[PDB]
């Protein structure tokens, strides 16, 4: 998308000649290159980013490319130090690609970036899991403090929507749902249901006080077990 060759203190380029006639032409380059990303299993994903190398004007009739040293043509993958990813492997490829103006040589360098989840537990999963646990505390409070238990209901539901929105804001405007988006969606179910539970309890709380108290006593055990087993299936599925 945009590349440039470093300039300080002189244009960072080397020319070494050999009596052979062989030329060695080095450049130090920083490129920002397109890497289309499949964020469906985000943030438990990995991506394949490439660097496609080609000649602009000269066809295979005039130019050939080859990886000098084969497998060992690329160095420095070990030096890559990304906070968020880790390079699981890399791959070199050699191809001839055909356009309208003719057939050109290409080399394709590829990385596979496996994303580290540390950041996302801290900034999302914990807030979500804790906000779900918070919603289910309301089950242990006397049903007759209607305002208290609506506070638990409303605040947990709103803090869930704001998590799902703010988590969506760090990404591109893709039209699919990420693995995190499901997790958050399900967490929203567990808090919205925790509210509707209380609303039901409050609907029986004078009519049939025995029943209302049984709803709570069931919920106090059903809700955490379901959320617990949901986590075990979700995490197993995405690891």
């Amino acid at each position, epitope marked *: 998308k945009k590349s440039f060759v470093h300039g300080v203190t002189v244009k960072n380029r080397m020319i070494r000649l050999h009596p052979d006639g062989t030329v060695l032409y080095g450049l130090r380059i920083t490129t920002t290159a397109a890497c289309m990303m499949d964020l469906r299993r985000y943030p438990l994903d990995e991506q394949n980013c490439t660097l496609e190398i080609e000649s602009y004007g000269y066809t295979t009739d005039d130019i050939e490319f080859y990886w000098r040293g084969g497998d060992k043509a690329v160095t420095g993958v070990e030096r*890559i130090e990304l906070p968020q990813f880790s*390079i699981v492997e*890399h791959r070199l490829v050699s191809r001839n690609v055909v356009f309208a103006t003719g057939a050109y040589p290409r080399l394709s360098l590829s990385f596979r970036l496996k994303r580290n989840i540390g950041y996302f537990v801290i900034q999302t999963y914990l807030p979500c899991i804790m906000t779900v646990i918070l919603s289910q505390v309301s089950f242990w409070l006397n049903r007759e403090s209607v305002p208290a238990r609506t506070v638990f209901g409303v605040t947990t539901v709103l803090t869930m929507t704001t998590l799902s929105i703010s988590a969506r804001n760090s990404l591109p405007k893709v039209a699919y749902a990420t693995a995190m988006d499901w997790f958050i969606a399900v967490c929203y179910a567990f808090v919205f249901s925790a509210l509707i539970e209380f609303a039901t309890v409050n609907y029986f709380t004078k009519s049939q006080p025995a029943r209302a108290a049984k709803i709570d006593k069931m919920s106090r055990i059903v809700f955490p077990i379901l959320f617990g087993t949901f986590n075990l299936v979700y995490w197993a599925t995405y690891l």
Partner: nanobody
Amino acid sequence: QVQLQESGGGLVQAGGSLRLSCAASGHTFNYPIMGWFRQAPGKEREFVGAISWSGGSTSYADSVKDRFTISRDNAKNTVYLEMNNLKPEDTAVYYCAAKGRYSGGLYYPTNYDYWGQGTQVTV
């Protein structure tokens, strides 16, 4: 500074296996890449392989490729070297080295700042 110590070297029979360890202490962050070198009695110090700070990316010599594996466990500040299907050609003093962040190519020993007094492997 950094201090490296090895272990796990010993006598092994051909086709056998052995696991070398290298425990590190001190400023391991400033020296992210870890490397393994071996020194045969007669020959020069040879590059075996190396591993990154994240532990994800590795690199091996062709002779040692496919028969050895290097792993990292930053929890224990330790890199491991599993040597399987060992040959008599592998016999040497195996060294553990740490390289500075911008210290150039992996293969060349000069670039590594810190070494550990090696452990013997005989096959």
